Amino acid sequence: MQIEVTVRNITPIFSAAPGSNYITIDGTINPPPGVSRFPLVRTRMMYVAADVGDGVIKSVPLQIVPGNTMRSLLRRTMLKHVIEPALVEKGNKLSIGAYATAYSGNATGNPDGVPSSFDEIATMRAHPFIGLFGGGPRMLEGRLMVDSLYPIHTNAERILGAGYENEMMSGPIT
RNA sequence: GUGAACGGUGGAGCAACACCUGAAGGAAGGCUUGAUGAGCGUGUUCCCCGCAUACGCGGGG
After folding, report:
1. What are the residues whose beta carbons fall under 8 Å from the beta carbon of A167, sequence distance 6 or more?
2. Whole-number Å distance between alpha carbons of A164 and A5
3. Residue of A137, A160, A140 whose CA lies nearest to A6
4. N or C terminus of chain A with fewer C-beta within 10 Å?
C-alpha cells in the first residue's frame, strides 16, 4: 500500500550533509585554498539522473531530506503521542532496552546471529508498531518503506513519474 | 662403418547444475553580520643621532 505525503515547508530545511565543506563571503562553494575559507555545513543533497537537455540525462544535485531522518521522525511521532500514551494510560512499563529498541531499532550494537522462532516473527510483524519498524536483537524486517523527502522540482522529474506536471520548481532552491 | 642403422604417444571427451548480501539505524544538538576604523586640545627655539668635518644637511620627543 502506497502513501504519498505531499508537504510544503514553512521554514527553511537544514539536514546537514556530512563533510568539511567551505564557502567564501560571496558564494563560491569549496574554493581553492587561500581565499579565507569559512566552514559550511551544506544541506543534504541527492544526486538524481535528470533531463538536462533534449535527449541527455545527467546526474544533477537535488536537495532532499534522507529517508532515515523521515523514518525516525515517523517512529518518534507515533512513539511520542500514540504509543507511550497507550502504555502509560494503561500503566505498562517498557524496559530501558525496550525503550532503546522501540526508539532506535536495537537495544545494543550487537545483533544475535541466531534466528528467532516463526511464531515470534509472525506476532511482531502482526504487531502495530513492531511490524512497521523491525530490527531488534534478531534483526526483524519491518513492513514500512520510508522514502527520502524529494522536492517538487524538474530535477526530480524522473523521480515523480510525471504525476505532477504543474508547480515544478526550475531554479535553485537553496 | 658410434650393439649402429630405422621407429609420432597417439586418437576422443562441456566443470557443470542451483543459490536475494541482507535485515535495523535522525547529522545533529547550540551560535546577533555586527561592528570597527569617519568629526573633536596645544602657538616658538629646548634635548640627542648620523653624513660631514662644521659652510650645513637629514632626523628622535
Report:
1. A152
2. 13
3. A160
4. N
In this complex, the nucleotide whose C1' atom is nearest to the CA atom of residue A133 is: B24
C-alpha cell at A72: 525516525
- Measured CA to CA in angstroms, residue A169 lies from A13, A25, A45, A157 at distances of 16, 27, 16, 10
A131 Cβ contacts chain B strand, under 7 Å = no
Q: At residue A150, what is the residue type?
A: Y
A69 touches strand B (CB under 7 A): yes
Solved by what technique? cryo-EM
Nucleic strand B contacts from chain A, 79-98, CB < 7 Å: none
Query: Cβ(A16)–Cβ(A32) under 8 Å?
Result: no
Q: How far apart are CA A7 and CA A169, in angstroms?
A: 15
Tell me how far apart the alpha carbons of residues A101 and A81 are, in angstroms, rounded to a whole number.
17
Cα three-residue angle A142-A18-A137, rounded to 5 degrees: 30
From the alpha carbon of A134, which nucleotide's C1' atom is closest? B24
Separation CA A153–CA A87 (nearest Å): 42
DSSP class of A58: E
